[PDB]
Amino acid sequence: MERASLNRIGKDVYYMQIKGEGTIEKVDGRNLRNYTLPAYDEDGVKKQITFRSTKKENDHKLNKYAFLRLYVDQDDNSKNEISSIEVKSYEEIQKADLPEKVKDKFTIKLE
């Protein structure tokens, strides 16, 4: 009826999975190329995030089954008033990089 598994500290890190690619959204009469995929934070709570290929991102990667790791920064980091309150970077990873809660949130205990 009780466990000493008390932990109240988390991190500003999210995890996403690749579902598709060719997605267009026409804004101002102009066709934009963006990606909208489901994500989970370190606690495993469901999220939905939209990213895009920057001038820093090479192609070929992003495997339709592989996972992603999204880094978000805190609005006031330390000395600078302006910071990356939105997703500053992302990383392509495997199920092993995922925390125990998140991995189960993706596979739904299927494996």
Short mmCIF file of all heavy atoms in Angstrom, two decimals, residues 20-70:
data_model
loop_
_atom_site.label_atom_id
_atom_site.label_comp_id
_atom_site.label_asym_id
_atom_site.label_seq_id
_atom_site.Cartn_x
_atom_site.Cartn_y
_atom_site.Cartn_z
N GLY A 20 5.35 10.67 -40.44
CA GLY A 20 5.39 10.94 -41.87
C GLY A 20 6.36 12.06 -42.25
O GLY A 20 7.23 12.42 -41.45
N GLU A 21 6.22 12.61 -43.45
CA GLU A 21 7.12 13.67 -43.93
C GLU A 21 6.38 14.75 -44.74
O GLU A 21 6.13 15.85 -44.24
CB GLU A 21 8.24 13.03 -44.77
CG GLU A 21 9.45 13.94 -45.01
CD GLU A 21 9.27 14.91 -46.18
OE1 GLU A 21 9.55 14.52 -47.33
OE2 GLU A 21 8.88 16.08 -45.95
N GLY A 22 6.00 14.43 -45.98
CA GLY A 22 5.44 15.41 -46.90
C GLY A 22 4.17 16.11 -46.39
O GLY A 22 3.06 15.72 -46.74
N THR A 23 4.36 17.16 -45.59
CA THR A 23 3.23 17.92 -45.02
C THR A 23 3.33 19.41 -45.37
O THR A 23 4.33 20.06 -45.06
CB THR A 23 3.18 17.77 -43.48
OG1 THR A 23 3.21 16.38 -43.11
CG2 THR A 23 1.94 18.43 -42.89
N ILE A 24 2.29 19.95 -46.02
CA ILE A 24 2.28 21.37 -46.42
C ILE A 24 1.13 22.13 -45.75
O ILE A 24 0.03 21.60 -45.55
CB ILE A 24 2.14 21.52 -47.96
CG1 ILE A 24 3.33 20.85 -48.68
CG2 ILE A 24 2.04 23.00 -48.36
CD1 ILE A 24 4.68 21.44 -48.33
N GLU A 25 1.38 23.39 -45.39
CA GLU A 25 0.35 24.28 -44.87
C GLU A 25 0.47 25.67 -45.52
O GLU A 25 1.50 26.33 -45.39
CB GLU A 25 0.44 24.38 -43.35
CG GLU A 25 -0.71 25.15 -42.71
CD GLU A 25 -0.75 25.01 -41.20
OE1 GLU A 25 -1.34 24.03 -40.70
OE2 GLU A 25 -0.18 25.88 -40.50
N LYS A 26 -0.57 26.10 -46.22
CA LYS A 26 -0.49 27.33 -47.02
C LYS A 26 -0.88 28.58 -46.21
O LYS A 26 -2.06 28.83 -45.95
CB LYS A 26 -1.38 27.21 -48.27
CG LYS A 26 -0.94 28.13 -49.41
CD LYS A 26 -2.06 28.41 -50.41
CE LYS A 26 -2.55 27.15 -51.10
NZ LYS A 26 -3.56 27.47 -52.14
N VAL A 27 0.13 29.38 -45.84
CA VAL A 27 -0.09 30.63 -45.09
C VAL A 27 0.29 31.85 -45.95
O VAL A 27 1.31 31.83 -46.64
CB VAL A 27 0.73 30.64 -43.78
CG1 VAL A 27 0.48 31.91 -42.98
CG2 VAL A 27 0.43 29.39 -42.94
N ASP A 28 -0.54 32.90 -45.91
CA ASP A 28 -0.34 34.10 -46.75
C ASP A 28 -0.37 33.75 -48.25
O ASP A 28 0.19 34.47 -49.09
CB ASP A 28 0.99 34.79 -46.41
CG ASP A 28 0.95 35.54 -45.08
OD1 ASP A 28 0.58 36.73 -45.08
OD2 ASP A 28 1.31 34.95 -44.04
N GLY A 29 -1.06 32.66 -48.60
CA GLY A 29 -1.09 32.19 -49.98
C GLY A 29 0.20 31.49 -50.39
O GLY A 29 0.42 31.19 -51.57
N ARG A 30 1.06 31.21 -49.41
CA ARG A 30 2.36 30.58 -49.64
C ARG A 30 2.43 29.21 -48.94
O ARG A 30 2.09 29.07 -47.77
CB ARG A 30 3.48 31.50 -49.13
CG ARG A 30 3.52 32.84 -49.86
CD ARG A 30 4.56 33.78 -49.25
NE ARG A 30 4.17 34.26 -47.92
CZ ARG A 30 4.97 34.30 -46.89
NH1 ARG A 30 6.19 33.90 -46.99
NH2 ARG A 30 4.54 34.77 -45.77
N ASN A 31 2.88 28.19 -49.67
CA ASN A 31 2.95 26.82 -49.15
C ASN A 31 4.17 26.62 -48.24
O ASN A 31 5.31 26.62 -48.70
CB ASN A 31 2.98 25.82 -50.31
CG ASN A 31 1.73 25.90 -51.17
OD1 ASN A 31 1.66 26.69 -52.10
ND2 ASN A 31 0.74 25.09 -50.86
N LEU A 32 3.92 26.46 -46.94
CA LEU A 32 4.99 26.21 -45.96
C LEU A 32 5.15 24.70 -45.71
O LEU A 32 4.18 23.95 -45.75
CB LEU A 32 4.69 26.93 -44.64
CG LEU A 32 4.50 28.46 -44.76
CD1 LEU A 32 4.19 29.07 -43.39
CD2 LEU A 32 5.74 29.11 -45.37
N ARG A 33 6.39 24.27 -45.46
CA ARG A 33 6.68 22.86 -45.20
C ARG A 33 7.02 22.63 -43.71
O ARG A 33 8.11 22.97 -43.25
CB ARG A 33 7.85 22.40 -46.09
CG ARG A 33 8.15 20.90 -46.03
CD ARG A 33 9.33 20.54 -46.92
NE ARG A 33 9.55 19.10 -47.00
CZ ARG A 33 10.54 18.54 -47.64
NH1 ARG A 33 11.47 19.25 -48.19
NH2 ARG A 33 10.62 17.25 -47.70
N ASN A 34 6.07 22.06 -42.97
CA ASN A 34 6.24 21.85 -41.52
C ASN A 34 5.85 20.42 -41.11
O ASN A 34 5.13 19.73 -41.82
CB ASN A 34 5.40 22.87 -40.74
CG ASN A 34 3.95 22.90 -41.18
OD1 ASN A 34 3.58 23.65 -42.07
ND2 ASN A 34 3.11 22.08 -40.58
N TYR A 35 6.32 19.99 -39.94
CA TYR A 35 6.03 18.64 -39.43
C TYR A 35 5.36 18.70 -38.05
O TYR A 35 5.90 19.28 -37.11
CB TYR A 35 7.34 17.84 -39.32
CG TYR A 35 8.16 17.81 -40.60
CD1 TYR A 35 9.01 18.85 -40.92
CD2 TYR A 35 8.07 16.73 -41.48
CE1 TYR A 35 9.76 18.83 -42.09
CE2 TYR A 35 8.82 16.70 -42.64
CZ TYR A 35 9.66 17.76 -42.94
OH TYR A 35 10.40 17.73 -44.10
N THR A 36 4.18 18.09 -37.92
CA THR A 36 3.45 18.05 -36.64
C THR A 36 3.35 16.61 -36.11
O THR A 36 2.67 15.76 -36.69
CB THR A 36 2.01 18.62 -36.79
OG1 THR A 36 2.06 19.97 -37.29
CG2 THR A 36 1.27 18.61 -35.45
N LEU A 37 4.03 16.34 -35.00
CA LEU A 37 4.10 14.98 -34.45
C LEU A 37 3.81 14.95 -32.94
O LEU A 37 4.03 15.94 -32.23
CB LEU A 37 5.48 14.38 -34.73
CG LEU A 37 5.84 14.18 -36.22
CD1 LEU A 37 7.27 13.68 -36.38
CD2 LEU A 37 4.86 13.22 -36.88
N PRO A 38 3.32 13.80 -32.42
CA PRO A 38 3.07 13.62 -30.98
C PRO A 38 4.37 13.47 -30.17
O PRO A 38 5.35 12.88 -30.64
CB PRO A 38 2.24 12.31 -30.91
CG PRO A 38 1.87 11.99 -32.33
CD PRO A 38 2.94 12.60 -33.19
N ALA A 39 4.38 14.01 -28.96
CA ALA A 39 5.56 13.95 -28.10
C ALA A 39 5.18 13.58 -26.65
O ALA A 39 4.01 13.55 -26.29
CB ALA A 39 6.30 15.29 -28.13
N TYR A 40 6.19 13.30 -25.84
CA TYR A 40 6.00 13.04 -24.41
C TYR A 40 7.16 13.66 -23.61
O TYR A 40 8.31 13.59 -24.03
CB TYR A 40 5.95 11.52 -24.12
CG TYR A 40 4.80 10.79 -24.79
CD1 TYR A 40 4.95 10.18 -26.03
CD2 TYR A 40 3.56 10.69 -24.17
CE1 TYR A 40 3.91 9.50 -26.63
CE2 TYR A 40 2.51 10.01 -24.76
CZ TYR A 40 2.69 9.42 -25.99
OH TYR A 40 1.65 8.74 -26.59
N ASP A 41 6.85 14.27 -22.47
CA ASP A 41 7.90 14.81 -21.59
C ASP A 41 8.52 13.69 -20.74
O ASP A 41 8.12 12.53 -20.83
CB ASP A 41 7.33 15.92 -20.70
CG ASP A 41 6.09 15.47 -19.96
OD1 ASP A 41 6.22 14.87 -18.87
OD2 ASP A 41 4.98 15.70 -20.47
N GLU A 42 9.49 14.04 -19.89
CA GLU A 42 10.19 13.05 -19.06
C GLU A 42 9.23 12.25 -18.15
O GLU A 42 9.49 11.09 -17.83
CB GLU A 42 11.27 13.75 -18.21
CG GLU A 42 12.12 12.78 -17.38
CD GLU A 42 13.27 13.47 -16.67
OE1 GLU A 42 13.03 14.15 -15.65
OE2 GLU A 42 14.43 13.34 -17.13
N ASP A 43 8.12 12.86 -17.75
CA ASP A 43 7.12 12.18 -16.91
C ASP A 43 6.20 11.29 -17.77
O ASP A 43 5.49 10.42 -17.25
CB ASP A 43 6.31 13.20 -16.11
CG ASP A 43 5.36 12.54 -15.11
OD1 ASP A 43 5.82 11.72 -14.30
OD2 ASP A 43 4.15 12.86 -15.13
N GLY A 44 6.22 11.50 -19.08
CA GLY A 44 5.45 10.67 -20.00
C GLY A 44 4.08 11.24 -20.36
O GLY A 44 3.25 10.56 -20.96
N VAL A 45 3.83 12.50 -19.99
CA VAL A 45 2.54 13.14 -20.30
C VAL A 45 2.49 13.55 -21.79
O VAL A 45 3.42 14.16 -22.31
CB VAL A 45 2.29 14.38 -19.41
CG1 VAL A 45 0.89 14.95 -19.65
CG2 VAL A 45 2.51 14.04 -17.94
N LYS A 46 1.39 13.21 -22.46
CA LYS A 46 1.29 13.41 -23.91
C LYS A 46 1.36 14.90 -24.31
O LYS A 46 0.80 15.77 -23.65
CB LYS A 46 -0.01 12.79 -24.44
CG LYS A 46 -0.11 12.86 -25.96
CD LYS A 46 -1.37 12.17 -26.49
CE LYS A 46 -1.43 12.23 -28.01
NZ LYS A 46 -2.61 11.50 -28.55
N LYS A 47 2.08 15.15 -25.40
CA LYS A 47 2.26 16.50 -25.95
C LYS A 47 2.10 16.45 -27.48
O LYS A 47 2.07 15.37 -28.08
CB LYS A 47 3.66 17.04 -25.60
CG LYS A 47 3.93 17.18 -24.11
CD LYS A 47 3.07 18.27 -23.47
CE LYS A 47 3.34 18.40 -21.97
NZ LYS A 47 2.99 17.15 -21.24
N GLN A 48 1.98 17.62 -28.11
CA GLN A 48 1.95 17.70 -29.58
C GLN A 48 2.78 18.89 -30.07
O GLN A 48 2.45 20.04 -29.80
CB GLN A 48 0.50 17.80 -30.08
CG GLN A 48 0.38 17.67 -31.60
CD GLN A 48 -1.06 17.65 -32.07
OE1 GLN A 48 -1.68 16.59 -32.17
NE2 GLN A 48 -1.62 18.81 -32.35
N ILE A 49 3.87 18.61 -30.79
CA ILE A 49 4.82 19.65 -31.18
C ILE A 49 5.04 19.68 -32.70
O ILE A 49 5.07 18.65 -33.37
CB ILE A 49 6.19 19.44 -30.46
CG1 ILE A 49 5.99 19.47 -28.93
CG2 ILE A 49 7.21 20.49 -30.90
CD1 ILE A 49 7.26 19.19 -28.14
N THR A 50 5.20 20.89 -33.25
CA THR A 50 5.45 21.09 -34.68
C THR A 50 6.85 21.68 -34.94
O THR A 50 7.18 22.75 -34.44
CB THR A 50 4.39 22.04 -35.31
OG1 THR A 50 3.07 21.49 -35.15
CG2 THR A 50 4.65 22.27 -36.80
N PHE A 51 7.66 20.97 -35.72
CA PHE A 51 9.02 21.42 -36.04
C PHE A 51 9.23 21.57 -37.56
O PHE A 51 8.37 21.19 -38.36
CB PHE A 51 10.07 20.44 -35.46
CG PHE A 51 10.01 19.05 -36.04
CD1 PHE A 51 10.91 18.66 -37.04
CD2 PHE A 51 9.08 18.12 -35.60
CE1 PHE A 51 10.87 17.39 -37.57
CE2 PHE A 51 9.04 16.85 -36.13
CZ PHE A 51 9.93 16.48 -37.12
N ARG A 52 10.38 22.12 -37.95
CA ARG A 52 10.71 22.31 -39.37
C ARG A 52 12.22 22.17 -39.61
O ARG A 52 13.03 22.44 -38.71
CB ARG A 52 10.22 23.69 -39.85
CG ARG A 52 10.46 23.95 -41.33
CD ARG A 52 9.96 25.33 -41.76
NE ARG A 52 10.66 26.41 -41.06
CZ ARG A 52 10.13 27.57 -40.79
NH1 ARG A 52 8.93 27.85 -41.17
NH2 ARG A 52 10.82 28.45 -40.15
N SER A 53 12.59 21.74 -40.81
CA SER A 53 14.00 21.58 -41.18
C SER A 53 14.70 22.94 -41.32
O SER A 53 14.41 23.71 -42.23
CB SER A 53 14.12 20.80 -42.50
OG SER A 53 13.37 21.42 -43.54
N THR A 54 15.63 23.22 -40.41
CA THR A 54 16.39 24.48 -40.44
C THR A 54 17.60 24.39 -41.38
O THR A 54 17.89 23.32 -41.93
CB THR A 54 16.91 24.87 -39.03
OG1 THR A 54 17.95 23.95 -38.62
CG2 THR A 54 15.78 24.86 -38.00
N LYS A 55 18.33 25.49 -41.55
CA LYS A 55 19.53 25.50 -42.40
C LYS A 55 20.67 24.68 -41.76
O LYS A 55 21.72 24.47 -42.37
CB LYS A 55 19.99 26.95 -42.68
CG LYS A 55 20.39 27.78 -41.45
CD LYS A 55 21.79 27.46 -40.90
CE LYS A 55 22.91 27.81 -41.88
NZ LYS A 55 23.01 26.86 -43.02
N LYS A 56 20.46 24.24 -40.52
CA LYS A 56 21.44 23.43 -39.79
C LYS A 56 21.20 21.93 -39.99
O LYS A 56 22.04 21.11 -39.63
CB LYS A 56 21.37 23.75 -38.28
CG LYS A 56 21.87 25.14 -37.91
CD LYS A 56 23.39 25.26 -38.02
CE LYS A 56 24.14 24.44 -36.96
NZ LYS A 56 24.06 22.97 -37.19
N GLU A 57 20.05 21.58 -40.56
CA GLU A 57 19.62 20.18 -40.61
C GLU A 57 19.84 19.52 -41.98
O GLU A 57 19.28 19.94 -42.99
CB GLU A 57 18.14 20.08 -40.21
CG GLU A 57 17.88 20.48 -38.76
CD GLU A 57 18.76 19.71 -37.79
OE1 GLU A 57 18.77 18.46 -37.86
OE2 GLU A 57 19.44 20.33 -36.95
N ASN A 58 20.67 18.48 -41.98
CA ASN A 58 20.87 17.65 -43.17
C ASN A 58 19.71 16.66 -43.34
O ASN A 58 19.07 16.27 -42.36
CB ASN A 58 22.20 16.89 -43.06
CG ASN A 58 22.24 15.98 -41.84
OD1 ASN A 58 22.63 16.40 -40.76
ND2 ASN A 58 21.83 14.74 -42.01
N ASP A 59 19.47 16.23 -44.58
CA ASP A 59 18.38 15.29 -44.88
C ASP A 59 18.83 13.83 -44.64
O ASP A 59 19.78 13.59 -43.88
CB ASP A 59 17.91 15.48 -46.33
CG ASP A 59 18.94 15.03 -47.35
OD1 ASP A 59 20.04 15.62 -47.40
OD2 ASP A 59 18.67 14.06 -48.09
N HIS A 60 18.13 12.88 -45.26
CA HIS A 60 18.44 11.43 -45.14
C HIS A 60 17.96 10.84 -43.81
O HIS A 60 17.40 9.74 -43.78
CB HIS A 60 19.93 11.14 -45.35
CG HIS A 60 20.44 11.48 -46.72
ND1 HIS A 60 21.33 12.49 -46.98
CD2 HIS A 60 20.18 10.90 -47.92
CE1 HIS A 60 21.60 12.53 -48.27
NE2 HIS A 60 20.92 11.57 -48.86
N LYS A 61 18.17 11.56 -42.71
CA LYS A 61 17.75 11.08 -41.39
C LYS A 61 16.21 11.14 -41.22
O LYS A 61 15.48 11.26 -42.20
CB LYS A 61 18.42 11.88 -40.27
CG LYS A 61 18.06 13.37 -40.24
CD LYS A 61 18.33 13.98 -38.87
CE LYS A 61 18.03 15.47 -38.82
NZ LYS A 61 19.04 16.28 -39.55
N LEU A 62 15.75 11.04 -39.97
CA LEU A 62 14.31 11.02 -39.66
C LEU A 62 13.67 9.75 -40.21
O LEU A 62 13.02 9.76 -41.26
CB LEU A 62 13.60 12.28 -40.19
CG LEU A 62 14.09 13.61 -39.58
CD1 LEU A 62 13.32 14.78 -40.18
CD2 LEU A 62 13.95 13.59 -38.06
N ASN A 63 13.90 8.64 -39.52
CA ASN A 63 13.38 7.33 -39.92
C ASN A 63 11.96 7.11 -39.40
O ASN A 63 11.70 7.28 -38.21
CB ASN A 63 14.32 6.24 -39.41
CG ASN A 63 15.72 6.36 -39.99
OD1 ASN A 63 16.04 5.74 -41.00
ND2 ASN A 63 16.56 7.17 -39.38
N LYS A 64 11.05 6.72 -40.29
CA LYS A 64 9.63 6.53 -39.93
C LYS A 64 9.43 5.32 -39.00
O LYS A 64 8.94 4.27 -39.41
CB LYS A 64 8.78 6.38 -41.20
CG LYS A 64 7.27 6.42 -40.93
CD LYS A 64 6.44 6.18 -42.20
CE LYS A 64 6.40 4.71 -42.62
NZ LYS A 64 7.73 4.19 -43.04
N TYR A 65 9.86 5.50 -37.75
CA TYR A 65 9.76 4.49 -36.68
C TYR A 65 10.69 4.89 -35.52
O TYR A 65 10.46 4.53 -34.36
CB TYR A 65 10.14 3.07 -37.16
CG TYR A 65 11.62 2.84 -37.42
CD1 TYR A 65 12.45 2.36 -36.41
CD2 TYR A 65 12.19 3.08 -38.67
CE1 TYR A 65 13.80 2.14 -36.63
CE2 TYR A 65 13.53 2.86 -38.90
CZ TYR A 65 14.33 2.39 -37.87
OH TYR A 65 15.67 2.17 -38.10
N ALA A 66 11.74 5.64 -35.86
CA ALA A 66 12.72 6.12 -34.88
C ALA A 66 12.14 7.22 -33.99
O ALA A 66 11.07 7.77 -34.26
CB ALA A 66 13.97 6.61 -35.60
N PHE A 67 12.87 7.57 -32.93
CA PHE A 67 12.40 8.54 -31.95
C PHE A 67 13.20 9.85 -32.02
O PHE A 67 14.23 9.94 -32.68
CB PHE A 67 12.49 7.94 -30.54
CG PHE A 67 11.72 6.65 -30.40
CD1 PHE A 67 12.34 5.42 -30.62
CD2 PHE A 67 10.37 6.66 -30.06
CE1 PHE A 67 11.63 4.24 -30.50
CE2 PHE A 67 9.66 5.47 -29.94
CZ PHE A 67 10.29 4.27 -30.16
N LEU A 68 12.69 10.87 -31.33
CA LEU A 68 13.30 12.20 -31.32
C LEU A 68 13.40 12.73 -29.89
O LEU A 68 12.63 12.34 -29.01
CB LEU A 68 12.49 13.19 -32.17
CG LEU A 68 12.46 12.90 -33.68
CD1 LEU A 68 11.60 13.93 -34.41
CD2 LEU A 68 13.87 12.87 -34.26
N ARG A 69 14.33 13.64 -29.67
CA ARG A 69 14.56 14.25 -28.37
C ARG A 69 14.60 15.78 -28.53
O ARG A 69 15.49 16.32 -29.18
CB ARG A 69 15.89 13.72 -27.84
CG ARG A 69 16.27 14.15 -26.43
CD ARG A 69 17.60 13.52 -26.03
NE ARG A 69 18.06 13.91 -24.70
CZ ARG A 69 19.29 13.74 -24.30
NH1 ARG A 69 20.19 13.27 -25.11
NH2 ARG A 69 19.64 14.06 -23.09
N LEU A 70 13.63 16.46 -27.94
CA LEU A 70 13.49 17.91 -28.12
C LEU A 70 13.93 18.68 -26.87
O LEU A 70 13.50 18.39 -25.75
CB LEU A 70 12.03 18.28 -28.48
CG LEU A 70 11.55 17.88 -29.89
CD1 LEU A 70 11.59 16.36 -30.09
CD2 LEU A 70 10.15 18.42 -30.16
#
